[PDB]
Every structure is written in C-alpha cells, then in structure tokens.
Amino acid sequence: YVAVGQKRSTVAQLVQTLEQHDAMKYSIIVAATASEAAPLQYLAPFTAASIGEWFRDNGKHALIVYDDLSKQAVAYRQLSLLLRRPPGREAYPGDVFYLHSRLLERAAKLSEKEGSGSLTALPVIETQGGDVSAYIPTNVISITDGQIFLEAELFYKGIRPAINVGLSVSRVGSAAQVKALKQVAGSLKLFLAQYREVAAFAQSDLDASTKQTLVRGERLTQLLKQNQYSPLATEEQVPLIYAGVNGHLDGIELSRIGEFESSFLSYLKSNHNELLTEIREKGELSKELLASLKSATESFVAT
C-alpha cells in the first residue's frame, strides 16, 4: 500500500486497522505523507515499485496500490515548477505523461519463461468533482486498461461501493474471471446497462415491458449493495449472482433483497455446503452443479 500525500495520522489509523485485521503479515506499507518533502513524494511511487519488482521477480503474484497518483502529480508539479520548467496544461509539467507512464508500465504479469510473477497495479486517482476530462485523470485512463469510476451521488445513496457501470470498464478483466463467476454472472453487466437505459426514460412514457426490466433492474441494484469492510467468499458470491441472474429477485420483494442475501447464504450453508465446496473446487458449474443450485435457489426462494 503506497500512501502518497496522506496525513501521518491517517496512515497511523490505517496501519492500526491493518493490524486489527492482522493483515500486516501479508502486506507492506510504503509511506510518503504530506509532511514528507515533495521530492520524496515524487520519488515515492518509483521506489515502491522497485520493492514490488523483487516480489514479481521471485515469480510470485503481488499487488501494489498507489493511492493517490494525483498527489504524485502535485508533487512532480511542485518540483518541476521549482526547477523552472515551463508549465504544461493545468500547470502540471509537460513531462507528466512520461512520469505516470514510467510508473505504471513497470507492473504486469511476466511470461511463463520469465516466471509466474505478476505485479497487479491498481492506482487510485482522486478526482475532485469527478472531472473525467481533467488532464491528470485522462492521462491515467489512457495509460491503464480498465477504470473503476465511483459515483458520489450513488455513494451518498448507500451504494457503497458505488460503481458507475457507465464509467467503469475493465479491458481484459473478464478473461481473468473464474468460470463459475463468468457463467452465473454472464450478461448481468449488459442487463444492468439495460436497467440504466430503462430508467433513463422511466423518469416521456413507460410500458410494461420496460417496467418488467425496471422491476428486475431496481431489484438487482439492491442486490449489488455491500457493507464496507465486510468481504465475501467467492463461493458465496456464485449463488447470490445465480439467483439474481436467473431472475429470482422478482421473486423477492425489493425491500427484502438484503434479507434474502443473508438468509440465502445461511440456508445454503445449513442445507448443503457440499454444493458450495463443489463449485469452489470445480470452479465451474457443471450441469449437475447448475441443477443442484437451481434446485437450491428455488428451495430457499420458496422459504
């Protein structure tokens, strides 16, 4: 976890949080707080990536989260301006494109010949006001593959994490997904980009066909929601998504969708955790697994 431009206090809470979840044993924290000098901040991501490359070059899979490169931009800006390099757009120096590209492109999953190493890089860019035309954000978007845009209005309206699917893409993400969560979740992204379209003209007239989709869509939106700092099991995610995709959320009233999830997971564990073990190991839903789940989902839905 690379912390750039963050308060020494805030980081101290983060560290303590990590030690509360006893996550320190699998994690490193590199720190370049706001107090720490701007040239140190400029050099802070680059140094962190060296540490990561040793893990990567141990052929081991890793992750590095650079939160936030936007504060690196301000740092490089400060340094650059104090080096009297003529300002670029938005006063961010002209070599800023190079700066970010140099940082970002050092992470990747190495060829099997060169080992199994991967350095997963998810850089967390802090948009003030969701300015997705802004120079620092756009440059990052162009460098990266995916985006995970998070909408404040939705965040406020209790979608935590708020995922504005309209501005979230992940270019090669889908072929990394486990087949179980590819099958069960298949086309749901399309479906909720029909919920988006449907609700566009929902608020003009409406028809029952659109309304049926809207009823499904709204109910699916309820299903998406999560409570922060509570993670889920992959196995557990397969049935919930199975239920919703297979339209069992017209079968659950919109209000009770949250209830349905907790109860459904409890039902599944008590009724037969054998199924969940099977989809967990097989990592695919065979016809048998699919049927067992179809049966199980119908069984819970009924009760």
């Binding site: 308060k7 706001a34 107090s35 701007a38 504060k71 800006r77 400060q78 104090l82 300002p87």
Partner: protein
Amino acid sequence: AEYFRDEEGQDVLLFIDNIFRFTQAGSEVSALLGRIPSAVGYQPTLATDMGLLQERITTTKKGSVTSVQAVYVPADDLTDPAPATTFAHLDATTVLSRGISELGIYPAVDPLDSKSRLLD
C-alpha cells in the same frame, strides 16, 4: 499550543481564523520570492505548507491539540484549488447557517449540512 500539549500535557483547542487568508498569504510570499505561481495563482508549495500546519496539529501521547479552522471558500467556489487542499486536511465540517438562526435555533449549526468523518 505545542508547549501546552507537549510540555504541560494539556488538551488544547486552537482556533485559526480564515485559512483562506492563510493560503492567500502564503501565495503572496511565494510570488514575492519569485516562484512560478501555480494554478489559480496558488503557491507551488501550497500543499506542503498546509501539510506542516495540519500535521503539527495532532494527538500526541502527552496531550492533544485539536484545531477549529475557519474556511471561507473564496469566490463562493468549493471547486477552487485552495478549498480542495483545505478539505483534504479537514476531518469534520461544521456548517453554521443563518437560515437556521432565523428558525430561532441557537446554536446556529445546520443539522443536515454538519457531517463528520468521525461519525462511525
């Protein structure tokens, strides 16, 4: 404040007036020093200077300073760079309102605009 906190163990509360005028003042000193003014005039050293001020303010294991700052968002814009830097440092916001005072409510503190990242 730090003498109180560190060397008298005190819990203290330090008011600052406009931190707009803190920023504004720093911006001028830079311009006088001849440093290239950055976006919306602001000093290139804006972040770091605010950082020192707002990292010195902390809870030590001796005492704690706590600081109430007054933020006059310049040009009524909360999209300006100076507000952004301020909001980064802020942990809570107290949003006094005169509409609220006009409802005879003293304190004048606006209930639905007062939000804090200390609520959890």
